[PDB]
């Protein structure tokens, strides 16, 4: 449809922050290759 | 013509210590070098 005319209107800072958080989460998780779970 | 040994417990203790040290070194061998990953 038209969208940009008057349909959807969202800011860019929110999307930038979401993309940065997703990238940081994908980076901080892919660097894991071993788990050590101790017994209580 | 002599030098007889009648003890075996210190030898087994030393062998077990060497095996434990080798196992520890092999376990910590992953997190080494610039191309290493992180553990959890």
Swiss-Prot record, chain A:
It is found in: Cytoplasm, Cytosol; Cytoplasm, Cytoskeleton, Microtubule organizing center, Centrosome. ADP binds at residue 10. Component of the chaperonin-containing T-complex (TRiC), a molecular chaperone complex that assists the folding of actin, tubulin and other proteins upon ATP hydrolysis. The TRiC complex mediates the folding of WRAP53/TCAB1, thereby regulating telomere maintenance. As part of the TRiC complex may play a role in the assembly of BBSome, a complex involved in ciliogenesis regulating transports vesicles to the cilia. It is linked to Intellectual developmental disorder with polymicrogyria and seizures: An autosomal dominant neurologic disorder characterized by a broad phenotypic spectrum. Main clinical features are developmental delay of varying severity, intellectual disability, seizures, and polymicrogyria. Additional variable features are non-specific pyramidal or cerebellar signs, and visual impairment. Component of the chaperonin-containing T-complex (TRiC), a hexadecamer composed of two identical back-to-back stacked rings enclosing a protein folding chamber. Each ring is made up of eight different subunits: TCP1/CCT1, CCT2, CCT3, CCT4, CCT5, CCT6A/CCT6, CCT7, CCT8. Interacts with PACRG. Interacts with GBA1. Interacts with DLEC1. Belongs to the TCP-1 chaperonin family. This is T-complex protein 1 subunit alpha. The chain holds residues 496 to 535 of 556 of the full protein.
UniProtKB/Swiss-Prot annotation, chain B:
ADP binds at residue 33. The modification Phosphoserine is found at residue 16. It is found in: Cytoplasm; Melanosome; Cytoplasm, Cytoskeleton, Microtubule organizing center, Centrosome; Cytoplasm, Cytoskeleton, Cilium basal body. ATP binds at residue 33. The modification N6-acetyllysine is found at residue 1. Belongs to the TCP-1 chaperonin family. Component of the chaperonin-containing T-complex (TRiC), a molecular chaperone complex that assists the folding of actin, tubulin and other proteins upon ATP hydrolysis. The TRiC complex mediates the folding of WRAP53/TCAB1, thereby regulating telomere maintenance. As part of the TRiC complex may play a role in the assembly of BBSome, a complex involved in ciliogenesis regulating transports vesicles to the cilia. It is linked to De novo genetic variants in nearly every subunit of the TRiC complex, including CCT4, have been found in individuals with a broad spectrum of brain malformations, and clinical phenotypes ranging from mild to severe epilepsy, developmental delay, intellectual disability, ataxia, and other features of cerebral malfunction. Component of the chaperonin-containing T-complex (TRiC), a hexadecamer composed of two identical back-to-back stacked rings enclosing a protein folding chamber. Each ring is made up of eight different subunits: TCP1/CCT1, CCT2, CCT3, CCT4, CCT5, CCT6A/CCT6, CCT7, CCT8. Interacts with PACRG. Interacts with DNAAF4. Interacts with DLEC1. This is T-complex protein 1 subunit delta. It comes from Homo sapiens. The chain holds residues 21 to 60 of 539 of the full protein.
